Design a protein around this nucleic acid. Structure first.
Length: 118
RNA sequence: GGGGCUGAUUCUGGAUUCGACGGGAUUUGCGAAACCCAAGGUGCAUGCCGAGGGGCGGUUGGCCUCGUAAAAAGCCGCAAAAAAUAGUCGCAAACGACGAAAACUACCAUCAUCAUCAUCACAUGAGGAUCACCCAUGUAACGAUGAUGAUGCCUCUCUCCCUAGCCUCCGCUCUUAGGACGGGGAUCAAGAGAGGUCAAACCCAAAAGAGAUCGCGUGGAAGCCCUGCCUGGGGUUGAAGCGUUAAAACUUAAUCAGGCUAGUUUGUUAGUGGCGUGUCCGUCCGCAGCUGGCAAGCGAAUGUAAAGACUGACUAAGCAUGUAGUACCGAGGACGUAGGAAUUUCGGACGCGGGUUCAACUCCCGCCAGCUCCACC
């Protein structure tokens, strides 16, 4: 599959601490992403009911009406995810997606930084 | 209404490795319930009439509770957030104001210097020169303007003045000047304090210093520690007066160390009489109390308590009743077992539901959803 980095990552962005997280797409979307029909423009995530949610990121189709335009989940540790929001309580850190990448079985992960950029 | 096309890009098997994501399950823990063993307290019981307060929701099973008139939890129901590399910082500030053209002059009740700018006179120059003049610079002399200093001249208000009973001065030497008992006078630069676009001012009130050499010395009595008796060496307070300048006249207190008698207490023993927490009994009997006798201590001693059980009779508690009914409570070792902890762990993110099956898109089987193409329209 492709590996895609994010454009301003070492420009106006400095990274204090780093984690990697698995993503929930749909496996049908993963086959299209293995091919590479994607766009990463302006991607971000926000915190909703104890979890971290990817609102913006687009994957195109390869069948029937399976929606590609709805938001996708990020999975991260039961202590550490629910703790790390209390790191950003200490007067602001941005959560940045540094790269999106594929494991050796061919499913997706995202590299996440706690950043002092703007 | 139809004609068609489109649906796991790990090759059969735990693996959508993973992604402490969310159920499910064991190993392992405490609340909860039950047992094994040790172990102490408790009167127990059945039954509850009425009264005041009382309000939903967010957190608590949306009524608490109690004892002869108040013994009886409580708040809230509403906005959010920080710094320095190819670019980039939205927009944002409160400070006031003017000028006028022509002529004279002072009493010493302020006085005095110095600084500057114009001028004459005495005076030099181996300075000069347009030739009776120009110029550095020493001495005398008028003038205006500006800064700067000072004990007084003045003027006004004013602390009582003169006298003195009493009287300092002194261990001793050495060295002074006066005040406020009493009285009389309509308050003076013989003394100060203040002012004129200017400045300075300490006679007055209940006595001092020094010759270093004790920073108030020197002098004396009485009572006393034991004290129940005995050994034991040596210490002080209450009080008075002498010495030079304010002139005193009796009163009661502070440590103990060692040995012990009479005398007395305790343990022990005997005994009259006392208390004994439900009232009444008694058997187990406990405790002090006080006399007589013994054994000991005489700074390790005269400090305070009031029962523990049962065979019996009559039986209580908030209120009523059953009174031989009957049990309640509580802590600790240790064998299990629920969403606490660790872990084998399944779904994982493959359109949507069936079967075969050790698992299935790959082995079978349905239906959807979309587009494309005929067509009433």
């Amino acid at each position: 599959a492709p590996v895609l980095e994010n454009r301003r990552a070492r420009h106006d962005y400095e990274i204090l601490e780093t984690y990697e997280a698995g993503i929930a797409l749909k496996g049908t979307e993963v086959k299209s992403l293995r091919a590479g029909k994607v766009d990463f423009t302006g991607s971000f995530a926000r915190f909703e009911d104890g979890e971290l949610y990817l609102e913006n990121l687009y994957i195109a189709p390869y069948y029937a009406n399976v929606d590609p335009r709805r938001k996708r989940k990020l999975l991260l540790h039961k202590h550490e995810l629910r703790r790390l929001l209390g790191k950003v309580e200490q007067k602001g850190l941005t959560l940045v997606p540094l790269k999106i990448y594929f494991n050796e079985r061919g499913y997706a992960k995202v590299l996440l930084g706690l950043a002092r950029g703007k």
